[PDB]
Each structure stands twice: as structure tokens, then as C-alpha cells.
């Protein structure tokens, strides 16, 4: 439970740390960039990262909306 | 001459008139709307109005005519016109503006449109403009529409509109010679998707349109297809097709005769006429085949090859009418099969030996000592290759001269003589990135994957400095082996998906010696890759320019020179 808390902030923490820099994606064009960077850390677990990017859009700071995916908020 | 005076006076008196309705006796009811003009203006300009009036029969002597199958708008911007010599043409109206100028027979405005269409043909309209062009008897635009529909088309093979075409000009677009395609099977899937758009509209068309397909593809996958499409117990096309492809014999395609070349610009021209040629090598076929002269002798300038193969030239100087040479901000684009510079939109200001770099289908010129000199001496500009504009993007934050820039990873990264700035397309900011420890100028730059290579500097020497981009640090790798006491000629480029050299050196009292060298990636060294003979090549000078890209040994000739 421990290290699986790990991997939930370490997927959170490379999100939030790349995505401010780089371009937006419509349905799954970060997300092959996002397992990329973590392929040397371990499995990309898709269902645990694609549960876990729809639940920042409560509130500010790239909330991401999911039905207006075409332009994501680039402000802090 | 007719006094020029005289006639504008005439001109604006009769728009004058025009304006208050005073002599006016014809009107044109066109849709409801009242349009009261003259007959002499509408003679003058329009061919079907002096038919109009001047023939005899009932419209001679009625003062209102019901001109139907027209537009109000094309109509009052042709009677403006024709009023005041003033076309304002916008990038939208100008279909119906033809159409009503083949409706009046007006040739004044009619070659007007042509023009503004001939400049206006690019890749998301060309299968459009071509069906106009077909609809309505136009030669020009039709062959300029049939080469650019050829290329991009085959390059894309993707636009809707290619669907709703005529048969005739199907069978010209795919039976021509000038089709550029890496394969002759990407042509045969596009006509299989076009003749499944109907299922009994195209049976007839089925037995022509496999006529001008090579038969390696007639007896191979697809005609199994064609039978699971056909019409039930049709035995008029199965048994036809089976015994039909006697005929046609193989014959290869232009397109597939594309190999990767080293353009050069600006070599020594071997007859003292011209001040510099433009050359080209072949890495394959050993020979060194001619390239047409840069428009009106244009010194000075810069190359880029997108990632779909087209050639640019930005910038440059032209000899004013010793030492005489004023800069020009024209920009053309290279014909890679009539072997001629196609004239372009030009730039904003004016450059010397700029930096052309393509991403995300713009061309980027950084730099390039500009005209102006401002507090933004150091302000780049990108083109549209889409809607055929330039816009202007965020400065260099640094003024630099004699740079050189590549594209990596979707951003542009221009470097000097230590310092480098990455530029963010999709934010569009400049970011610092890492710094040199080595001050060397005058040298080029290859990217190749995800890393950059700088190699020599100052002449020039043997220096190389490798990137990383997901790194962001200079490492050095090794020096090029070359010969003592020479001034070598580093050229950077990527060929066969691995970076070679293009390095020409000079010794004491010797001519000039060609040699290419193929660095290992992994092994950090340059290997002999092969050796450039001197009995095709000749000395091509010190200001010459390379580039990597995809040319036609057919369409191009041998350079006639002694070895």
C-alpha cells in the first residue's frame, strides 16, 4: 500500500512537473509521454493513472475539463 | 498617347454619375434587387452585355432586364469595377467572381481571378480548384491545378473532394507521368476507395480506370474485392477483368525515382557569366547532376527541406543596376520537377544569409541581418504554408550574428558562437538553455534524432560538440582525422538515417580534395564512407551552402564539365 501511494504521487508529481512545459492532448496523446518517462520506473498501469488524471479537474491549476478537451488551461 | 488626365477626369465623372443615378436608362433586376447602370460602361467592360444591347432583338429597346442565374454581390462588385477600375478580391468570393466573369464574358476581371487563383493554389484546395478549372474551360489553372494536384494529392490522397470528380479527369490525374508517389500500390488503394464511393456509378468506369494502372497490380490483391463489390450475377465484368490484362505492359512510375541528394547553392559557377551556380551530388549515382540558377542570381540566401521534401529560399541580395548588391525579401519555392523557382509570397524584411527551419509545417527565419537594426534587431518571423503568410513569433532574446539553427523534439534551437536559446512553438518563449565552453563561429549544425551536433567552428577546424536534448549539456566526442596544415570544409548533414560529413580540405599549394565520412554514433569515429573522385566533381567555392533532401535524376540533367 505503501510504495502503491508511492506510485500515485510520483505519477502526480512528473505530471504536474512536465505537462506545464509541454503541449495538451485530446484523449491519449500525454499519457504514451507520461508512461514513457516513468518505462525505467515501473508498469504505466493505465486504468491507476487514467483513474487518477480525471480526479484534479475539482478544481484549479490544469483542471484538465474533460468535455472541453481541446485547450487546456496553461496558468498556474 | 491618350491623355491620362482627361481619362481619369472621364472615369471618376462617370462614377460620379454612377453614384447619383443622373443618365442611367438600363437597370438589372437581378434576385429583386434594382442595379441602374449605363450600356456603354457594361459594353466596355463585359462581352455578353454589347451582345446585350447591340443585337437586335427585345432587350434593345426594354429597359429592364431579369439577368437571372447570378449574384447580387458579384454583380455590384463587377459594376464597381467596371465603373472604377477597383477589383477587391478576397480569398473567399472569388469562385462566384469567376463564375459571373464567365457569365458576362468579362476577360479584364476574368484574368484578374486567374492570377489571384494561380496564386492562390495550395494543398487544402487543389482537388477544388482543379474541378473548377474543369467545370470552366481554363488551361492555365488546369495545368498548374494538374502538377500541384498531382504532387500534393499523391503526397496526401486524403481530400474529400476527391471523391466528387468526373471520370475524364481521374483518368488524366492517374494515368500521368508527374505523380509522386514512394510506391505504385498507395495510387492503387486511392482509385479502389474512389470507384467503392458508388457500386453501379463506377462499373463502367471499372474497365478504364484499371486501364492506366500498371498491370503488377491487376493480377495481384484487389480484385477479389472488386468481385465481393460487384453487382449480383454481373458475368459482363468478372470473366472481362480475368482475361483483360494481356495489355499495359509494366512500365515504372516517375514518383519512385526519388534519391536522397546534397543540394548545393551558390558554387563556383564554371562559366564567369553567372557569379554562382547551383550544383547537386548524388551519394548513389556518383555523378554530379546541374540545379537550376537561384532566381535573378540570389546570393546570399538559405535552404530548408520540410519533412515533405519541398525546397525554399528565403532572403538574399540581388546586384543593384565594382561592388553593387542591394537585399531583396523575396521568397520562392523550388519546383522539384520543372526544374524552376516558383515565385512566392516575400517576407517582411529584408535578410542576408538567413536561417530557414521548418516545424510544425511554418518556416522559421531566425536572424539574417536584417534591414531594420532596431532595439529588436534580433525579431524572427514565420511563414504559413497553409493560408501563404507571414507572422511574426517571439524575439531572440539575444542579438547574434553568423548563427545557425535546427529543429529538434517540435522546438527550434538556434545556436551561436556559446550561447543557445530554445524556442517553445506552442507557448511561443524563449527558454535558456546550456552554454558552451568553446567560442567558435562560422559552422553548421545537423540534427539527427534527438541530439545536435556542431561540428567545426572558428577557417573552420575539426571541433564537434554533441547535445542532448533530454540532457542539456555539451559533451565532446572526438576530432575528424584529416590532413596536417589544410583549411578542411565541415558540411553537417544526416543521410541514411546515420550523420555524415561533408568536408572538403585544401593543401599547401594543392587543389581542393572531396571526401564525405560517416561518424559512429556509438563508436564516437568517422569512418570512410566513401571517397568523392575528383573527376566528376569540381572546386565549388567557400560560400556554398548543403542540405539534405530528394531529388529526380530524370527531370534534372548532367552538368556538361571537365572533370
Redesign the interface.
Known amino acids: 500500500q505503501k510504495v502503491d501511494d508511492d506510485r500515485k504521487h510520483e505519477i502526480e508529481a512528473a505530471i504536474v512537473r512536465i505537462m506545464k512545459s509541454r503541449k495538451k492532448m485530446q484523449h491519449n496523446v500525454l499519457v504514451a509521454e507520461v508512461t514513457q518517462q516513468l518505462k525505467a520506473r515501473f508498469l504505466p498501469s493505465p486504468v491507476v493513472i487514467k483513474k487518477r488524471i480525471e480526479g484534479l479537474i475539482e478544481r484549479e491549476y490544469l483542471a484538465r475539463t474533460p468535455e472541453d478537451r481541446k485547450v487546456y488551461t496553461y496558468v498556474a | 498617347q491618350i491623355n491620362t488626365e482627361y481619362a481619369v477626369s472621364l472615369l471618376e465623372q462617370l462614377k460620379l454619375f454612377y453614384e447619383q443615378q443622373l443618365f442611367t436608362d438600363i437597370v438589372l433586376i437581378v434576385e429583386g434587387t434594382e442595379f441602374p447602370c449605363h450600356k456603354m460602361v457594361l459594353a466596355t467592360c463585359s462581352s455578353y452585355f454589347r451582345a446585350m444591347f447591340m443585337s437586335g432583338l427585345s432587350e434593345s429597346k426594354q429597359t429592364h432586364v431579369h439577368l437571372r442565374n447570378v449574384d447580387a454581390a458579384t454583380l455590384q462588385i463587377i459594376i464597381t469595377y467596371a465603373y472604377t477600375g477597383n477589383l477587391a478580391m478576397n480569398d473567399s468570393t472569388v469562385e462566384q467572381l469567376y463564375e459571373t466573369a464567365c457569365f458576362l464574358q468579362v476577360e479584364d476581371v476574368l484574368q484578374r481571378c486567374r492570377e489571384y487563383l494561380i496564386k492562390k493554389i495550395n494543398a487544402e484546395n487543389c482537388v477544388r480548384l482543379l474541378s473548377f478549372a474543369d467545370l470552366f474551360s481554363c488551361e492555365e489553372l488546369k495545368q498548374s491545378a494538374k502538377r500541384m494536384v498531382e504532387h500534393k494529392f499523391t503526397a496526401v490522397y486524403h481530400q474529400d473532394a476527391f471523391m466528387q470528380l468526373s471520370h475524364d479527369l481521374l483518368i488524366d490525374i492517374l494515368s500521368s507521368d508527374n505523380l509522386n508517389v514512394e510506391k505504385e500500390e498507395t495510387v492503387r488503394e486511392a482509385a479502389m476507395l474512389w470507384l467503392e464511393y458508388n457500386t453501379e456509378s463506377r462499373s463502367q468506369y471499372l474497365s478504364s480506370v484499371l486501364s492506366q494502372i500498371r498491370i503488377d497490380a491487376l493480377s495481384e490483391v484487389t480484385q477479389r474485392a472488386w468481385f465481393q463489390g460487384l453487382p449480383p450475377n454481373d458475368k459482363s465484368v468478372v470473366v472481362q477483368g480475368l482475361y483483360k490484362s494481356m495489355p499495359k505492359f509494366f512500365k515504372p512510375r516517375l514518383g519512385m525515382t526519388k534519391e536522397e541528394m546534397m543540394i548545393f547553392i551558390e558554387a563556383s559557377s564554371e562559366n564567369p557569366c553567372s557569379l554562382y551556380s547551383s550544383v547537386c551530388y548524388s551519394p548513389q549515382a556518383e555523378k554530379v547532376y546541374k540545379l537550376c540558377s537561384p532566381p535573378a542570381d540570389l546570393h546570399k540566401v538559405g535552404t530548408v527541406v520540410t519533412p515533405d521534401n519541398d525546397i525554399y529560399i528565403a532572403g538574399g541580395q540581388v546586384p543593384l543596376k565594382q561592388t553593387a548588391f542591394r537585399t531583396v525579401n523575396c521568397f520562392y519555392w523550388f519546383d522539384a520537377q520543372q526544374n524552376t523557382w516558383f515565385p512566392k509570397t516575400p517576407m517582411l524584411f529584408v535578410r542576408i544569409k538567413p536561417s530557414l527551419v521548418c516545424c510544425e509545417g511554418y518556416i522559421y527565419a531566425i536572424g539574417g541581418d536584417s534591414v531594420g537594426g532596431e532595439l529588436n534587431r534580433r525579431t524572427v518571423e514565420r511563414y504559413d504554408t497553409e493560408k501563404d503568410e507571414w507572422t511574426m513569433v517571439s524575439p531572440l532574446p539575444c542579438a547574434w550574428q553568423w548563427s545557425a539553427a535546427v529543429v529538434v523534439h517540435?522546438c527550434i534551437y538556434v545556436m551561436t558562437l556559446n550561447l543557445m536559446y530554445c524556442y517553445?512553438p506552442?507557448?511561443d518563449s524563449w527558454v535558456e538553455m546550456a552554454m558552451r565552453q568553446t567560442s567558435r563561429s562560422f559552422a553548421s549544425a545537423a540534427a539527427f534524432g534527438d541530439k545536435i551536433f556542431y561540428i567545426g567552428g572558428l577557417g573552420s577546424s575539426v571541433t564537434v560538440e554533441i547535445y542532448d536534448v533530454n540532457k542539456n549539456e555539451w559533451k565532446m566526442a572526438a576530432n575528424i582525422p584529416a590532413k596536417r596544415y589544410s583549411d578542411p570544409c565541415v558540411r553537417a548533414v544526416v543521410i541514411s538515417n546515420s550523420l555524415c560529413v561533408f568536408m572538403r580540405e585544401t593543401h599547401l599549394n594543392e587543389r581542393a580534395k572531396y571526401v564525405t565520412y560517416q561518424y559512429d554514433l556509438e563508436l564516437d569515429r568517422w569512418s570512410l564512407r566513401q571517397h568523392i573522385s575528383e573527376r566528376v566533381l569540381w572546386d565549388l567555392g567557400r560560400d556554398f551552402r548543403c542540405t539534405v533532401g530528394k531529388l529526380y535524376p530524370s527531370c534534372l540533367e548532367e552538368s556538361p564539365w571537365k572533370p
Request: net charge neutral; no cysteine; aromatic share 24%.
Open positions: 517540435d517553445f506552442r507557448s
